[PDB]
Ligand binder design. Sequence first.
Ligand SMILES: *[C@@H]1O[C@H](CO)[C@@H](O[C@@H]2O[C@H](CO)[C@@H](O)[C@H](O)[C@H]2NC(C)=O)[C@H](O)[C@H]1NC(C)=O
Ligand SMILES: *[C@@H]1O[C@H](CO)[C@@H](O[C@@H]2O[C@H](CO)[C@@H](O)[C@H](O)[C@H]2NC(C)=O)[C@H](O)[C@H]1NC(C)=O
Ligand SMILES: [Cu+2]
Ligand SMILES: [Cu+2]
Ligand SMILES: [Cu+2]
Ligand SMILES: [Cu+2]
Ligand code: NA
Length: 499
Amino acid sequence: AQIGPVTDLHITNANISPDGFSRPAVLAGGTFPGPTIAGNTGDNFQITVFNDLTDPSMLTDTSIHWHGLFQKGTNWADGPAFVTQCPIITGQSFDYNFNVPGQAGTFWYHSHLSTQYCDGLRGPFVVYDPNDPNASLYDVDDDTTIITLADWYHTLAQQEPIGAAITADATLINGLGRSFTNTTASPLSVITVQSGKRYRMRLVSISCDPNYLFSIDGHDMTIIEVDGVNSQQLTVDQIQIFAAQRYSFVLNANQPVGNYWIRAQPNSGGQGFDGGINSAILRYEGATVEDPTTTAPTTFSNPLVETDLHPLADLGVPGQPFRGGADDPLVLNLAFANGRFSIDGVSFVPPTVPVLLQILSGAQNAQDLLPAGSVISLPSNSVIEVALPAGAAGGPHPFHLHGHNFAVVQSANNATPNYVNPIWRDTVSIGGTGDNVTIRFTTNNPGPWFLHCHIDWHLEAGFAIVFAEDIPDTASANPVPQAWSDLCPAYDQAHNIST
Ligand SMILES: *[C@@H]1O[C@H](CO)[C@@H](O[C@@H]2O[C@H](CO)[C@@H](O)[C@H](O)[C@H]2NC(C)=O)[C@H](O)[C@H]1NC(C)=O
Ligand SMILES: *[C@@H]1O[C@H](CO)[C@@H](O[C@@H]2O[C@H](CO)[C@@H](O)[C@H](O)[C@H]2NC(C)=O)[C@H](O)[C@H]1NC(C)=O
Ligand SMILES: [Cu+2]
Ligand SMILES: [Cu+2]
Ligand SMILES: [Cu+2]
Ligand SMILES: [Cu+2]
Ligand code: NA
């Protein structure tokens, strides 16, 4: 069952064996992935998060981010530790009480402390639209049509060297999959469809690192949503999905009744499908209960290319139709050396006082804010352009901005900008050497918004900055509840920190 929009959510430690290898984890709702949190557009969500964690090897503090929800007027509920709150300590709880005006689509939630989400605290978050403009394109859209793609590690996150090329031990599809080494024939996930029906498949990358080449043997996929933004219909036979991205696609169950492989090939770790790694099963009602015998093609003739995507609505692009044609045009220098990433010469290290609390206490320009050099102020009601030229090791880097989505004016692997009708999204691959992926948005949401690579190992190694958007209006726009004001005293008391 789905839970929400008003629910408790317990965060616990437990052993799990999603690929047949047992290890301890950090879990929401006792499962991997966590339960789906759902509601309708415009609903009030009140997710009371109970921190019941006791195992220090995966951290006993926690904080949860609602990925892709704008949090307008509720910056305090966004979740990134040391940016919008101090962590929740064990044996305490915290009500994330916010609203989702003007958004409907496929989202997710995850720990936003250190690399803790890798250890298991990740699940889907869906905001349905009762008047969805795409409703007539499918028959079925429910918890059974959500498809999660996850990387899974046998080594605990806090034992992963900072800045390393960290590699997973299994791909999990809907929580199940087989290990790349010492492969055992442990259970694969089954997605069941009825011949003739059309399904809104909600494809969610809950990855900590790899991107996946996702396809379904014998089937194509008609994309209708990108990171929460409705798209024009685009039919493809393969989707390359980067960490934290989401797509909805229509699956037409129009092939002969039978069993078909679902494939998710990561860019690192195990390559291919031997022993059923990187796989799940699409089963038609009435098919024999047996593994598929289908084959992938040698190449995919209609793969997703990001510049083919266009919004369903006339969203346009803010600003003027040329590079630098914005009120505040930025170019970030994105680098990696010696185990640490940097942005504009500064490697992100979380401050002791959360950025939002520094601003509410009166720090009112970005040079007064800590970490020094890691906070950039944005002016209010202005068009912002951010170029993100690639080249830093460990790519392709999927960059994500909190508090916003953005027009993708220039995509990976294509030097041509689009100032007319590019897709809008919230997490974008910045591509490869020589690319100049560029995003635009308007500043109508005061507060500190994190900008970072969503490969969680890279964030931990410093690949982040904070946009302090409209510092002067942050306090009036974001009144804070007492429980939020209580978090930093409680956390600092528990950890013997002075401030
Ligand atoms: C990416 O595009 C940005 C502009 O969006 C380019 O920025 C210019 O960089 C040159 C020096 O490289 C400066 O003279 C300009 O002031 C910058 N802003 C402009 C022209 O609007 C950036 O060079 C591009 N990077 C790559 C790798 O192509
Ligand atoms: C490279 O990106 C550009 C810009 O998004 C794409 O150019 C568009 O191509 C569409 C489809 O043919 C045309 O309708 C638009 O007028 C083009 N826009 C511009 C600004 O040129 C281009 O197709 C992409 N390249 C590849 C190989 O997909
Ligand atoms: Cu996220
Ligand atoms: Cu986010
Ligand atoms: Cu990265
Ligand atoms: Cu984040
Ligand atoms: Na415009």
